[PDB]
Amino acid sequence: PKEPEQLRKLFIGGLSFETTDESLRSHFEQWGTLTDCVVMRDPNTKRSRGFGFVTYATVEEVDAAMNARPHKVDGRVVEPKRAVSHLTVKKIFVGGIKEDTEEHHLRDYFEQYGKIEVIEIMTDRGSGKKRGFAFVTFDDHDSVDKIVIQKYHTVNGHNCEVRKAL
Numbered sequence: 284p285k286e287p288e289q290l291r292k293l294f295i296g297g298l299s300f301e302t303t304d305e306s307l308r309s310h311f312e313q314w315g316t317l318t319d320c321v322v323m324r325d326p327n328t329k330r331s332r333g334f335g336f337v338t339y340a341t342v343e344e345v346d347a348a349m350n351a352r353p354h355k356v357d358g359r360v361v362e363p364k365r366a367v368s369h370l371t372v373k374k375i376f377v378g379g380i381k382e383d384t385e386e387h388h389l390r391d392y393f394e395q396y397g398k399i400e401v402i403e404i405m406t407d408r409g410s411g412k413k414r415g416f417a418f419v420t421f422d423d424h425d426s427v428d429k430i431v432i433q434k435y436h437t438v439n440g441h442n443c444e445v446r447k448a449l
């Protein structure tokens with residue numbers, strides 16, 4: 284069936300106050316079918332609040348829209364983000380990797396979510412032994428947002444716990 288609607292929405296911040304439901308839709312329809320598209324406005328003045336949201340038919344369409352950033356909508360670069368599960372960060376904690384998980388295990392898996400800048404496999408300050416967790420830093424927050432909404436992460440045969448970090 285259909286992916287949950289929450290996972291198909293993009294919050295668009297930084298809109299030009301002249302962007303309308305129609306111009307936001309015409310822009311974002313380039314990357315998929317939009318089932319919803321709304322500019323948020325003041326209830327009394329009708330003046331734009333400078334943000335809005337679009338809902339795609341599928342998660343792959345959300346991905347396509349995010350991969351097409353930066354988006355310049357009505358002359359202004361906007362800020363799309365997936366809906367809250369916003370804690371906008373570029374780093375994840377990866378736990379449950381035990382002592383046999385290496386850098387290449389984490390890189391080969393996580394590189395398909397985004398461009399990796401740092402992998403830090405955590406070791407004991409006294410003994411140097413691996414502690415069984417790591418941090419991965421990406422160049423952009425959407426990688427992290429995709430990662431943390433998955434129910435499961437399997438890396439090196441381990442079922443891992445993944446959370447946003449700082």
Ligand SMILES: CN[C@@H]1CCCN(c2cccnn2)C1
Nearest residue numbers: 375376378416446447448449
């Ligand atoms: C072994 N438990 C670790 C130690 C410190 C890192 N940590 C987290 C968890 C979520 C986000 N950032 N860091 C928990």
